[PDB]
TrEMBL record, chain C:
This is Cyclic di-GMP-binding protein. The chain holds residues 731 to 775 of 779 of the full protein. Tightly associated with the cellulose synthase catalytic subunit. The chain crosses the membrane at residues 15-36. Belongs to the AcsB/BcsB family. It is found in: Cell inner membrane. Binds the cellulose synthase activator, bis-(3'-5') cyclic diguanylic acid (c-di-GMP).
Length: 780, 144, 45, 40, 144
């Protein structure tokens, strides 16, 4: 009451306190919250010297140091948050040029060491100079010695301290090797990961299965079989990309009369004319003799606008009477009318650069048995370069060249599976023909594609692989080498990674619920024998792929994406089961906290480890629904922003340099350097640079936004259109842990928003509790 | 009114009181809590003028020295005046040996560590509040 | 015991076992590098 | 454009034969007699 | 300035005190917690001028070396000077053998691991707080 404070306290201090209370109230603070805030503030003022300049600066920088605390809105338990943040500030950490220069020079020397070693080995070019028998004997004894040493290192019993020292030494060696570029470093990391994984598997098989309790024995056997399958998949993946071929283009003969004939096919079913016009314009701009290149548009819709465009620009056009077998049948029907020596296929969205056939056809003219060449449409890029080593690079459905006679001999493109490309590649490989892969960008057109496309491809591919295995099994076939079979089996296993993930999700609950000992070993040994496996696998995969962002978190992304596609893949051979599993995991957490606070202290550490495991599971499960709600959320369209210097010429003769921000068939939006009073509706000329040439395009300014100017193209001609498409499209072109935590949290939030109500309540309560707990977490 | 601008706190004498607390815990000091409370009140009372406050501190420095001497078990100044002849009779080396024997370097190290701790903690904890609280507690225990 | 004796000899040596593992890794990497270079040359040319 | 592609990789011996440029040059020599006379 | 940002911390000496902590965890040190605390306060004494701070560290380096010698079980300077004649009279091979026998490579490996861990922690977490807390804890244990 105001009277009680007014009579109890002198009017000045009472006015000050009531003013602070009203300031709190106006910001939504409750009476209880504001009273508690005043109490805490007066205690802090009487105890903590907030008048001191240090505390003055702290209060001035209050928002930076205490992001999660609202000073204007005191809340219950706010002093707890203040104490937590003060402890973090005391514990946390808040000649530099010379040290930075030394560190950078050391890193640069580490990076450049392979080149120096390569030069040193080049002057002593050199086994390779011995006889056949001598080389065989030396290699045999060397391999035997190295294998025996590796076997000893795998199967050596250790105590915790020696084991920890071993882990630290191997991890340091792997980290040092990872800095060195080259294929030898990748080979060393592959061998080291193999050794560590073999050690882990041997320990699991010989010292972790519990042979007393039948239930624990069965659970351990199932988990160990899942781990063995995962290890086999990892080894096969290492084999696939152990040695990327890095194929380079063979120069064509300088006699242009010896070059072959190429038929470019652009099949479309429902794509608008705007999409296909760019591809056709780029195709006409491909640097290749005109009499040796024929362009075909294959429209299944019978659309008359496409026919008009084909007649105008001169490219051929064929529409079928029927529409069976979709794209594969369309191309098969079109093949009956083409007469070229090679058949190239481009998708509507893909933009073929003018240096495509020049960089591709050299190998066809050189190696006779080569029947297929694939160009990139990261991980996929390197799996296809590694496959080329074993001659297992398969048709990806677009941006490929196929020799005409082998294609007609195998009965054309296969039509028995959804993935006609992979089946065509398999049939070509079965007859002894060879396939290649060139890692040279075309124009890549579409940007991002989002997970909507990512899932389209991921699924249509799994179903096709399953069908191919069902009908044209690589293992039971004839005429395929061992490495090609290994690559195909690796793809199938990658698409079959659904059951081990479920076993991994259910095992920690199989401990926490039934009180079993699926992994009969002390938790410290479990950590010391499992962590090196995952760390070395992550390091080796990061080095092989070379991704800029590389950690276990990218692997978590891969697992959550592949777990979202497990039900469709297994169907090829949601809400209810999934929320059931999530509730199972949360009940596991509850019984785990019960065990930890009331169970015997001997099993406490094991309980904690299983807690960590279940937390990882809860992250993955939320990620799977987060992607299910983020797959259909992309609304933006094709927008590529690249820097390219252009010129704008006015009617007055003034010429201004500009940089193009974005572009489309409707026109281009550019950023103009300097000040220019360009008025809308004024016809200007846009000069674009192609190599050492300049092409002038007449445009009219339709929108000006400050220095950003939008221009629209007047009705263009054919040659002008080709020049435009050549100058625009056919060009020469702990944080992650928090990100995954946010992904899981938002997935759980969406699950609470959209699951059945009977679990909507549970998930809403859980999300509220998680948010309240996170509100106390210290922040930098 | 804005009289809080005149309550300047103990400031340096905080360390004085902390040192006396330390010497009282180890048993080297003969403590009179009432006089200590009187001295704390005398140094804590506000005076409007900066010159008056500074003069108060300068005058109280000899008073603080006298209180420290009284709290210590050292003989009174009259004994020193009476025995100055005997003190001067001794050689310089004997006096140096005697003072080195008297000097307890452990307490000097403790004093230095306390000075550093006070100069660091004066920015984070109001040492005047705690010193006054402990002094009142000692007075309460010695009275009731 | 022909293997327990070997395990007991190297039971308390993590540094030596790490050195042996590094040597084996380097040797196998070199031999695999040779074989892969040979196969790559046989493939391209 | 071509130089950028050849810089992004090795491509040391693939001499680019621009069909479009050669055809335009041939047409220009066919159309303008002075250029044809001076070139050959 | 006014708020005394001159509390920079121990920085490198954190590793020094960490090594002392490890050796006291093994038993090779005749630790002197009071002298160590006085030395730490000498290192943590704030100095306004950077030149004075640098001079303080440079003067403290021999003091720290002498303190580490004092806290060890190695013989004092008098014994070192007495045995220097015997060391000179001994052959170089005998001195090399004595050095090889004295060096314990396990403790050198432990020191290297400690140095790497300290580098990582200093990249992430302040070390002066923990070192001073452990120093005060040891002094509290010794006092009571």
């Amino acid at each position: 009451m105001s009277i009680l404070t007014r009579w109890l306290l002198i009017p000045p201090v009472n006015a000050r306190l009531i003013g602070r209370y009203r300031d709190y109230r106006r910001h939504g603070a409750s009476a209880f919250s504001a009273t508690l805030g005043c109490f805490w503030m007066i205690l802090a003022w009487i105890f903590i010297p907030l008048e001191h300049p240090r505390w003055q600066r702290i209060r001035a920088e209050h928002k930076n140091l205490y992001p999660h605390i609202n000073a204007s809105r005191p809340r219950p338990l706010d002093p707890v948050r203040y104490l937590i943040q003060t402890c973090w500030l005391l514990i946390g950490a808040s000649a530099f040029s010379g040290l930075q220069n030394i560190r950078g020079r050391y890193h640069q020397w580490m990076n450049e060491l392979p080149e120096r070693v390569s030069h040193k080995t080049q002057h002593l070019d050199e086994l390779g100079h011995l006889s056949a028998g001598a080389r065989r004997l030396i290699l045999g004894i060397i391999v035997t010695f190295s294998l025996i040493l590796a076997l000893i290192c795998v199967t050596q019993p250790f105590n915790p301290l020696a084991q920890f020292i071993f882990l630290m030494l191997l991890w340091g060696v792997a980290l040092i090797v990872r800095r060195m570029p080259g294929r030898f470093s990748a080979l060393m990391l592959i061998v080291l990961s193999l050794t560590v994984s073999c050690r882990y598997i041997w320990w699991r098989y010989t010292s972790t299965l519990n042979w007393d309790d039948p239930v624990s024995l069965v659970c351990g056997l199932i988990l160990l079989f899942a781990e063995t399958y995962a290890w086999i998949v990892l080894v096969l993946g290492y084999f696939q990309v152990v040695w990327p071929l890095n194929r380079q283009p063979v120069p064509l003969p300088k006699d242009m009369s010896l070059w072959p004939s190429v038929d470019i096919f652009v099949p479309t079913y429902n794509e608008d004319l705007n999409v296909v016009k760019n591809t056709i314009y780029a195709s006409l701009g491909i640097d290749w003799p005109k009499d040796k290149l024929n362009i075909w548009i294959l429209d299944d819709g019978g659309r008359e606008e496409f026919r008009q465009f084909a007649q105008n620009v001169g490219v051929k056009y064929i529409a079928r009477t029927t529409h069976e077998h979709a794209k594969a049948g369309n191309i098969n029907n079109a093949l009956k009318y083409a007469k070229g020596e090679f058949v190239s296929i481009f998708d509507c969205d893909h933009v073929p650069t003018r240096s495509f056939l020049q960089m591709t056809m050299g190998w066809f003219l050189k190696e006779k048995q080569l029947a297929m060449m694939q160009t990139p449409h990261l991980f996929y890029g390197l799996v296809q370069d590694g496959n080329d080593m074993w001659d297992a690079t398969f048709f990806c459905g677009s941006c490929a060249v196929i020799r005409r006679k082998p294609l007609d001999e195998i009965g054309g493109i296969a039509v028995e599976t959804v993935t006609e490309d992979a089946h065509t590649s398999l049939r070509l490989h079965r007859r002894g023909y060879t396939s290649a892969y060139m890692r040279i960008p075309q124009a890549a057109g579409l940007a991002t594609e989002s997970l909507s496309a990512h899932i389209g491809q991921r699924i249509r591919w799994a179903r096709g692989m399953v069908q191919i295995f069902r009908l044209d099994n690589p293992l039971t076939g004839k005429g395929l080498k061992f490495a090609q079979r290994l690559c195909y089996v690796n793809a199938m296993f990658h698409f079959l990674s659904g059951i081990p993930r479920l076993i991994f999700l259910t095992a920690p609950l199989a401990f926490l619920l039934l009180h079993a000992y699926i992994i009969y070993a002390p938790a410290l040994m479990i950590a010391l024998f499992v962590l090196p496996h995952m760390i070395h696998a992550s390091l080796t995969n990061s080095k092989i792929q070379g991704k800029y962002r590389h950690s276990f978190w990218s692997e978590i992304y891969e697992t959550v994406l592949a777990w979202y596609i497990a039900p469709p893949t297994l169907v090829a051979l949601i809400s209810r089961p999934y929320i059931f599993l999530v509730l199972l995991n949360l009940v596991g957490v509850a019984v785990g906290i019960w065990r930890y606070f009331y169970g015997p202290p001997t099993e406490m550490l094991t309980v904690v480890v299983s807690m960590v495991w279940v937390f990882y599971n809860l992250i993955v499960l939320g990620g799977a629904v987060a992607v299910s709600v983020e797959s259909k959320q992309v609304r933006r369209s094709h927008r590529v922003e690249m820097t390219m210097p252009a010129a704008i010429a006015r009617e007055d003769g003034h010429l201004f340099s500009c940089t193009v921000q974005d572009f489309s068939d409707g026109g281009l939006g550019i950023k103009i350097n300097g000040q220019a009073q360009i008025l809308e509706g004024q016809k200007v000329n846009l000069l674009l640079k192609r190599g050492q040439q300049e092409y002038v395009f007449p445009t009219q300014v339709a929108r000006v936004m400050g220095n950003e100017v939008g221009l629209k193209l007047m009705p263009l001609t054919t040659q002008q259109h080709i020049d435009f498409v050549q100058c625009t499209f056919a060009r020469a072109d702990l944080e992650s842990l928090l990100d995954i935590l946010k992904l899981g949290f938002r997935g759980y939030r969406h699950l609470a928003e959209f699951a059945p109500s009977s679990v909507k309540g549970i998930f809403r309560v859980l999300t509220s509790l998680v948010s309240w707990v996170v509100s106390f977490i210290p922040r930098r | 009114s804005s009289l809080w601008q005149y309550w300047r706190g103990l400031s340096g004498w905080n360390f004085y009181f902390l040192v006396k607390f330390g010497l009282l815990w180890a048993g080297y000091l003969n403590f009179h809590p009432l006089l200590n409370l009187v001295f704390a009140a005398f140094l804590l009372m506000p005076l409007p003028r900066y010159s008056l406050h500074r003069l108060r501190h300068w005058i109280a420095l000899p008073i603080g020295f006298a209180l420290f001497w009284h709290d210590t078990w050292l003989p009174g100044p009259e004994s020193i005046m009476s025995q100055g002849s005997q003190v001067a009779g001794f050689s310089t080396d004997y006096l140096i040996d005697l003072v080195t024997r008297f000097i307890n370097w452990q307490m000097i190290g403790a004093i230095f560590v306390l000075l550093v701790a006070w100069l660091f903690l004066s920015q984070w904890i109001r040492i005047t509040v705690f010193v006054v609280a402990i002094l009142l507690w000692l007075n309460v225990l010695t009275l009731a | 015991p022909w293997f327990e004796r070997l395990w007991y000899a190297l039971a308390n040596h993590p540094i030596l076992l790490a050195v042996l593992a590094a040597i084996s890794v380097i040797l196998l990497a070199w031999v695999l590098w040779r074989l892969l270079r040979i196969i790559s040359r046989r493939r391209l040319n | 454009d071509i130089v950028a592609l050849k810089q992004a990789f090795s491509l040391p011996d693939i001499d680019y034969a621009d069909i479009s440029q050669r055809e335009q040059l041939a047409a220009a020599l066919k159309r303008w007699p002075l250029l044809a006379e001076f070139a050959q």
